[model samples]
Target chain A: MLGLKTSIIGRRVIYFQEITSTNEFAKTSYLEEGTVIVADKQTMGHGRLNRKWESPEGGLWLSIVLSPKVPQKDLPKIVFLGAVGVVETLKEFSIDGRIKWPNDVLVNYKKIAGVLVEGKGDKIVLGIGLNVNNKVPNGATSMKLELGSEVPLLSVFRSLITNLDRLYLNFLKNPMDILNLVRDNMILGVRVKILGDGSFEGIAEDIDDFGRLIIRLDSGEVKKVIYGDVSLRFL
Target chain B: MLGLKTSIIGRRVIYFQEITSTNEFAKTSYLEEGTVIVADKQTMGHGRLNRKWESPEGGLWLSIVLSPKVPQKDLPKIVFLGAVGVVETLKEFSIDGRIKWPNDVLVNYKKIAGVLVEGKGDKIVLGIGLNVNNKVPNGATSMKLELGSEVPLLSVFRSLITNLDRLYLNFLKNPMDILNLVRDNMILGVRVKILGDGSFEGIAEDIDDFGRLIIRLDSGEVKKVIYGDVSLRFL
Candidate 1:
């Protein structure tokens, strides 16, 4: 029992060697709020859009169950809060990284980690994977690759969960503060196309209070783009 | 035993003397597609916006279990088709009724009946409550109240289920056809106030292909009003 030092966020931790997906397991487990499911290896890790997540051993893969009291609109904030937790965790190792708006965590413009959150009614599952010592996938990097040395896994977990509990508490009091922290590191003020039924190029403007990516279109309209896949490009 | 002659809609009837809510019961009861649950009385019926429905004795309250093959975009049509079923049933009684867009059947600008459709994942429940011979709320009306005479309950059920079976079959082929029938009877070109985070007054303009109420706000920009509480305002 890796006893976490927090009132919330990680009061109880269930460890697994190989599992299907932490998020899927979290959904089935009859656990209260602040319960976390961690797996050293996921044979069937999944990302949003149902893409396969290559969650190898020696990486941090886990999901935290939250109080279902979280509303529909605030669900995205949990993912953004996760990005903050990851960024704060990386900060301890003196590894500076920024969030790619909705999910990706990047350092020096390379994907270092990813986050996925799933919810239905009162059930919420926040899943994250940071490439710690595992071999990073193509176009992705690990802490070992970034630091050129191995880092202790438990240290990363301790630092990360502390940040998570802190941010989650702040989020319950006032979510805007967490959103602002997310916005401070979000990759905005760039050019990208919002892909949908009709693809239109727009400047990556600021994210709004609802966590929608505000994109300024050529028509001089600032469109609040909700959930979508965005391809990054620089001018 | 209410022996419905239909091949699909009410072929398997589950009758109840009193049920809290047909929709709620339908969600829990193990039933196949085309199975229908009916209650002559509802002790605690419900409506959208969490409003308590006045489902007294001498009313028809029922729900149909459907295969969740329908997508998100097609969900609204189920309610629209239900409005068509109620309207067609009214026609059999030599009564003229028009739909109030999405899910209400209005006779003389008073809601004579209503329908509700709820879905989660692959489970779909379509519930309907018709005030056939019961007292309705202040803003609502019943068939007997509208007709000023008692109507045979059995005849109304037969007609409604027949129309439901017909539309449910045709809906599989093309939902637009059902939507077009709904559009034909909607109360359009009227003034209404849409309640939301900020209420806006607009003319009841059109129901678009997506079943969104296209309201032309005074700003003159045609705003596609999604889900909201719309209060009818003739003046």
Candidate 2:
């Protein structure tokens, strides 16, 4: 048994048999920068806006602690960086993967994985939940389904960890480089409906330099949306 | 046992014996909007840039959890709100206090207290450290020394809690109203020296609505400083 190799990431690893939330546990501990917390099972996983993120057996549920030198105003960009890492990892397993703005990784126009970015001081806890060999729970899909075969969980996890570390370091060196990559791979630009109090139909234009979505509304006015959920218009 | 009573304040008190940081702990816990966390000790107290905050015994260390309904862009103003609350509390003991732009409370040309503001979701945590009833540890001062009398610790704490709660609620109702009051009692108007590699003397003019210090340099250009330490320059 590999026993969750600790030295693989050059940091201490805290593996829990069961935990409420990886992000919550990491936030409380004296976990230094680069600390990784992985749970065999999370009792109360969470998504954006306090939504429930189902985490069962045979899935990847982890959170990595980061102490970046970036300004607080630029912290939101980390979400996009993590999305790119996840999508790239999925592509390795012959899975068609694309990134949803702000936080999700999609496969075949369905949610395959998600990322939640929580900041504390100059540090941020990037909580990632990726569907692996497990069955897709409710509104989720896995790389195995996309590839029509079983995918080794450990191999995929290792790929993701490697990609994340490289991209995160590159981002620290130059954030604009990652921003350019994210702009090229954003799946929101195709077609989507803005869901909110007053719904609007629009074609996704592009993400601004600050990561805000620039959606071309029906009224010919381009609205910059800093926060909202996008769904396929005619799915 | 009076048990930390006040006429119309501290109706709710949350005490933590040991935590990573009171501000971080209070952020997740289900506390009231104006909930106050009084910790006799904090294992991992933090200042700006995640620097260690000396939180040894004999210091009045606390963090208030709040959920103000304001635009995210105007969040920095909470630092001013906290400074005023601290200054008002120190004035009760006849201590002439001054506000250093962004987050410090000074007295008689020395540092007396510091404030750190952090926002999580709709909630904001205002962590404050005041050198009350404590001997000067690191060139710090207490209200007792300035006023030539040992002020009662419990009394000062209660007064601060009451005043902070009242002011915080008032700002929640009308933020601009509080902003006007802060502007009238502004302390940056005094002559001060900015601390850095290249120090410069100037008269602190005024803090803009976004909490940036407008310092009138000798060259006639009013430089807006978003972060740094300021020392009073007595002619």
Candidate 3:
């Protein structure tokens, strides 16, 4: 059912009972564009900036390989597309999801999904983690907890794949639309701290065409934050 | 002569008689920070955008691996430093070299050096290619050609390594100074075409703190061009 409907994306699906990480395998593999690597569980899942993610059973842990026909500078838009896909999927589940600038997806002010996009030359690996039936830790919520009942994993997976494929195809033609969707639900106008080397505090003002977060620092200096280089935390 | 003076960069040298590319080897090898991979020649040398670079026997082909304490976003600055190093070395030979944005170094409107900087996690591979005693083709200049006589490759190599080490140390303390040096020797205010996916024509305006080339296009739309993505050609 995975590859049966999509025109390009998810046309080839690689499944794993348990793996270190779907993203790690996709990066090192010779998989074709639109190939999906799915794992039931992950021993070592991580987010951007090498932050560890708890990938227990029943969540969606997958990576989709893509070769978008856009410039490498615009590759960051694919990450935004993944977040928009997650939010659109949450809409089908009747949950209002918002994006925290760059890639984390939140519902009711709690994290419910994450997207990490890594590119090498012409290939891009889009990794997504969505809390579905999994038992999420503190500050995180899953579909089971949200709707107060267990949801069918297959149903959620199908909806996610469908939304991603549609959004991805649409992205190649209309990337600005995807950018607008990401900006619409973004957690903005709040004081935040950019943690990593040369840490600084600022307000995430806007998302630029290249998908960089436009930050106005406390000292009135405007800085454009590159994705995957720093962690964003509320001040 | 390479490792004798520098305290960090070139402290651990990996000399090669011939190799595919110093950057490729440095990327795959488990080399430590401050390690320099120098080759007498490269069979498959490449510049940014994966463009083939002519690596004849008489040129300096080397890649330095560094684990800088700066964030990944600042890694692009390392490429600028490489270009600056080439310009500084050319100055010693009485050649006026100018940086043509991003990484190429030109002397009298002809390319004399190229730099490619690639970073994965904390490690950065800074590749530099300088035409020394080599016979350059059309639209290219070498130290030998500029002086109308064969120049000492070892002297140019030593000068480059010394300048790079000093600039790198200063970069850790005051990156703004290095940024100013790069801007001072930059070629700007010219119409150019960005070749690759989503090709466009624009005027190379200025460089930002994140090392992105700010281009104001023909349509009066300003765009920040990411390094290593597109080739720049003067129109």
Candidate 4:
């Protein structure tokens, strides 16, 4: 169903019973561009900054290969697009999801999906995991739990790939549209804490056109945070 | 002369008569950190943004492995350190070299050196090319050309490696010193065009504490340009 429905994204599909990480499998394999690799189970999924990712059987663990051919700095938006796809896909299931800064998809202010972008020279391996039809982890929500029933895997997969492919192709000509979409659906106008190196309390002002988290800090200074973990702060 | 005087950077040196590229050699060799790879000549050297670099025999073509282990975004400062090293080394030749926005070193308004940063999973290959004793290319200058004579090659090598070694080791607990050096000597209060999808004309107001180029754009907007091809322009 995913292969037939996701015309440009999941057209060439590779399935595995289990793998250490979907990204590891994709990176090792010299797959063609747009080839989608799916795993029934991932034992050792990874997240951004090389952190360990929790991937139980019920989650959507998949990675897609792409050759963006754009400047590598633009790759962060490519990673963030996964959040947009998951957010849009959730709309089909009547679930409202918003993006945390730097590609964490959240529902009810809890993380429900994450994206990791890696590369080898020119090729980019976009790895994304969504909590769908699976047991949601701590600080996360799941489609099954939200809908109070078992969601069809095919529907979630197709919706995700369709949305991802559209944004992926959209970047070639209209890169700003991706930025706009992310900005529109991001956690803005809220107090947040930027983690590590730039540990500060700030109001989430906007997501800049270059995919940075722009925050107005407590010191009455505005800073554009390029790389750091950000979390919501409740007053 | 450089091998004997340099402590760790060139202590374990690998030499090639000719190769595809020094960066290619390091990536393929999988050498240890602080290991220096040098080539007498390069068939195809490259620079930032994947533009082909001209590497004649008289130039210094080399790449060093560093494990800064900071946020990968912080790695740009490590790349910019090459400009810091080169700019300081120029003082020994009684020549003045100033750093452009990110990583190009210019002498008398012409490029004298360039740096390229690449990665293989966790390892960073900081590839640098200096027009030490080579003929100047178009829009480029050489040390020998600027000094009106061929400066002794040994002094240039030892000075460069030693300066870079101190900065790399200082990354832990003192990375800002490198940032400070770059900021102190960087082009400030000048208009530069940040090219690419985030293209804009802005005044290079200052390099912030995190090594970001702060630009006040023409639209009366302030932006922290984290990554882009920045070039000088006169409006």
Candidate 5:
């Protein structure tokens, strides 16, 4: 029996021994107003755009459904909210981590975890996958590895849910407060290269309130980059 | 035999006789990268935020799965793309239609159809529900009644998919172009009174490139109204 004490975040928990994707299940469950779906392993886990999210067992894959009072236009900021929650959760392990724009949680410049948020107009299903308990895969690392041993997945889930509940409540009370935190913790302000049709190098100056990344090009002209892939260069 | 032609929008087709919601089914199918799910009727259909969406027989309730090139920050604008598709489809019936901010297709102030855009970091599922081949429920109006007694659901679907594909392609080629179209067609420029919590009147001035409604409050203050239940009042 999973004795996970419920938090405001994971109030209604639907645990699955295995599923295609927690996000997929949670989205369709149309689970009454607020429900959280947790899966031990996702057989066909999804990353962004049908990319396979590796879930070879022993990983924490979960999705939370919520209906927020924020306007649809401002909903994009919620991605930042999830990122901040994950970053804060990782910090508890004393691991130095930073958020890559959009929703990638990076530690030591490698992807350790990722988040995907899907909205059903009024309600949103936020999916989070953290590399925990299990041994770090070829291209992934977990808090346990950083700490030199296996960490309890349940404890990690507890911390993450607690932090998420706190942040979500704070956002409902005051969205600007969370926006400010996102601005301060942005991965911009660092030397990075834009990847796509044409490549360009620039320093991430800031992100507009709506979450658009502002990059200062080499020509000293600041451009708002709303599309394209970005990579951070290690100095 | 359903001779459904392969759509550029729906890479894979998943048809169901009945389901809770087409959006919910498409989200869970995890079919192909760009899959689409269509249903004749939904046992439990919903609009934004778990709001009941009437999906009775003889209605078009479908969801398209897409992996758009637009960055996560620009996801909100996708709602406008869906609205343009819906409004254009209604125009085929010779019924004059207007778009409410975000994504509602209204025929003379009564909602005849609505679009819901659901985005997961890298993929987006656009759920569309339009009144077609069915009698208008109390507050709803169908294109058949608005135009005449002869309206075919197949014809409506054809126009809708075509328009949606065109707009989506245009957005992929040049997002600014589509943004301009949304601005021109939006009903935000009119004066309206917002109802919810308290009654407040304001002029709908403009929507930023990001789709945030910019309202000029009576107090000489320019407020960006992102989320709220707003009622457009005729002065």
Candidate 6:
């Protein structure tokens, strides 16, 4: 443990130098609620809609196991909360970031971090992949890429744990505030192309209470997108 | 079996004089895809968000088991398809019906039918409740109330099974048409009160491709409502 002063989250921590996927491991093995697992590198990381996540060394590959006492319908909020947590964590590092609906943290329209939530029985596994000191591909950015030098991975992890813990606790009481946080920082009112089961282009309208992306397609049809990889039409 | 001519849907049929809920029973037991179950009366029926359904005698209380070969994100379409099927089925009996977003069928602004979908592992259980001859409470309507006489429940059941089967097959080939079917039959641009985990009032704007209610709250916030009991603000 990092001797972090936290009540529930990060109370129990597991670390790995290399792993297939922290989220996959957490799902297969039974872990206590609020337990967090972090890996220095992942060989086979994935994102929402089964998209590949390039988790090279020096990135924060983390997964959190949560068993919240909330209804199944409200589960989508956890993924939104994770996105907000990532944005807040980036703020502490002097990196101004915004959220791209569903689950991506962006800096200057470049992806800096992403989140994915998976449900296994009554447990929820939340995976977060942040580009800290890792070398990112084109169209992506990292803390080191944004800034001149590298950022301490340990410091970033600590800040994320603290922010996530606070946000998770607050969410259990009043989620509207967290919803506002996401809406305020999200990239809205932009034309976006959704990629997944069905590909379509539309203007990003709003994020609903359930954390779904509301898009008004060019065909004048409003669509609530639950699972898709969204890219700005011309960013 | 009813000896229905459907190639897949209704290929296997299970009937009950009285049951708890078709959705519940279909979920607990193993059943083939495209299988349908019907009950003459439900001791404890329920709608979306676990609202009491009041599945009394002389109603079309039914459920269908489906294992669609599509992405999980597309599952909401099945519920919308079910709503459209209900509306189309009512139309065959000369009862013009409109759908309330997310799944409630109304005639002359009164609820005449409702639908609920549940997922169990790979199987999806779609439940539909249509008031044919049942006496409904105030603000609710039935075919008997509209026509001034009891319609044959067997005829109504056969029409529903056929409409649903046709829609399911078409949905597999091209879901957009089914989406249009839902959009065309849905009641839109009305003020609605959402009752659920968090209560709020908003103007129902549109129904998205994924079957979510797009509401523009008085607070100027566009919200996508997923699971809620919606009542018209003043109908």
Tens-place lDDT per residue, model 4, A141-161, is 888877788777756877788
TM-score versus the correct structure, for each prediction: 0.49, 0.48, 0.49, 0.49, 0.48, 0.48
Q: Which model, 3 or 6, shows the larger lDDT?
A: 3
How many pairs of residues collide in each model? 0, 0, 0, 0, 5, 0
- Name the regions of candidate 5 deviating beyond 4 angstroms: A1-7, A135-137, A227-235, B1-235
Off by over 4 Å in 3: A1-3, B1-235
- Ten residues in a row with the worst lDDT in model 1 chain B? B226-235
Over 4 Å off, model 6: A196-198, A228-235, B1-235
Q: lDDT per model, in order?
A: 0.79, 0.72, 0.82, 0.76, 0.72, 0.81
Residue range B1-235, candidate 2, lDDT tens digits:
1133332234444443344787887777766566566665567888877887777555677787777777776666787777888889888877878776667788866878889988777878888888775666566687766777766665667778878878777776677666666766667557777777777777888877766777898889787777744443433
| Residue-level error in angstroms, candidate 3, position A140 | 1.3
Candidate 4: Cα lDDT at A178: 89
Candidate 4 stretches greater than 4 Å from native: A1-7, A228-235, B1-235
Error of 5 at B101 (Å): 66
User: Which residue pairs in model 1 clash with each other?
Assistant: none
The predicted structure with the larger TM-score, 5 or 6, is 6
Tens digit per residue, CA lDDT, model 5, A1-235: 1223444565545555556888887777656544567777788888777788887566788888888887766777777778888888888878776777767787877778888888765778888888876655586787777788877776777788778888888877777677667676657668777766676788888787777777888899887776333444433
lDDT of 1 by residue, B1-235 (tens): 1224566777555555456888897888677677777777778788887789888777888898887355667866688878888999998897778877677888888888988888766678888888888878887788898889988786788788899999898887776787688778788998877766767788988888888888888889788866646544444
Candidate 2 vs candidate 3, TM-score winner: 3
Candidate 6 colliding pairs: none
Please estimate how well model 5 matches the true structure, expressed as its whole-model Cα lDDT.
0.72
**Candidate 1 per-residue lDDT over residues A128-197, each given as its tens digit:** 9999998877888988899989888877887888899999988887767888888888787888876556
Clashing pairs in 2: none
- The better-scoring model by lDDT among 1 and 4 is 1
The RMSD (Cα, Å) of candidate 3 is 24.7
Least well predicted 10-residue stretch by lDDT in candidate 6 chain B = B226-235
